[PDB]
Amino acid sequence: DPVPTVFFGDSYTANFGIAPVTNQDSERGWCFQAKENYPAVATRSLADKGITLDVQADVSCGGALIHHFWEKQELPFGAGELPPQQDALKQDTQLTVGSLGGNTLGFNRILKQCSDELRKPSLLPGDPVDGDEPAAKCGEFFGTGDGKQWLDDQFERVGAELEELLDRIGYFAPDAKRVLVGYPRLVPEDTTKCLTAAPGQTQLPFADIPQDALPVLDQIQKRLNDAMKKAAADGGADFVDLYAGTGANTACDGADRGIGGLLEDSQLELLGTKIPWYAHPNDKGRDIQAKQVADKIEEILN
């Protein structure tokens, strides 16, 4: 029996950096939705464990905020407007899986805040929160400065919106089992490991980001992790806690890293160029995601 399924989400579901991309040539070209994202790979793994997903839509797309689940997404350069991801759900939809939230928190603006390299033109959406404060001072800015309060505001919007996201699912796919996928760990518990460049890399995992800024960045992912877990417990969703088991597959775990580096090259080629990972899962990190996700679904369908 087919399990009608809809895959939704942001750059961690679409798997920015893995190529080839689906819709290469059409407007959804700018979602940077790998053909082989954790959704594709989980589907296959599940199939040979005999679980048959009949995938109805995979509308993950990069840069997607939580409210793009219910508002139009505007793709860069005039690519166009994509319709609300809620539009993919059907009443007969029985399983919904995706990660949404990092962008509403605005983890991209926290990266650019801590890095002037990142403050120049890049395909990473967003602006520094305070573009006048200097990259270097960023571990203060969010720990003691104005950033500290900007964080609690964002975190308040994030909880209200995940609750709302959980409720439209419940409204439109009333029979649907909801799986919220958490983000894997970016920085390890021992930041000193970030101080070395990964085997075969010339740049550091997090480029020009002050080493003192790394533990704040984890503090802030921990939080977002907890916000997401709560959101799901309280909304009747299941959560795939990727952070808790990626403690040795971070950005900084050398060749066991599951997060491609900030400036490291993805597989994405735009004119004769690799576009960097930008802190997104890599092949290893995408296999963990697929595995952990395939694991929960199986659990949940039994």
For the annotated catalytic residues, the residue numbers are: 11, 63, 103, 280
> At a CB cut-off of 8 Å and minimum separation 6, what does 107 contact?
220, 221, 224
Max distance between CA atoms of the chain, in angstroms, equals: 57
Which two tokens mark 194? 């970030």
Contacts from 198-203 at CB under 8 Å and sequence distance 24+?
Answer: 198/252, 198/254, 198/255, 198/257, 198/261, 198/264, 199/254, 199/255, 201/261, 201/264, 203/261, 203/262, 203/263, 203/264
Other beta carbons less than 10 A from residue 258's beta carbon:
23
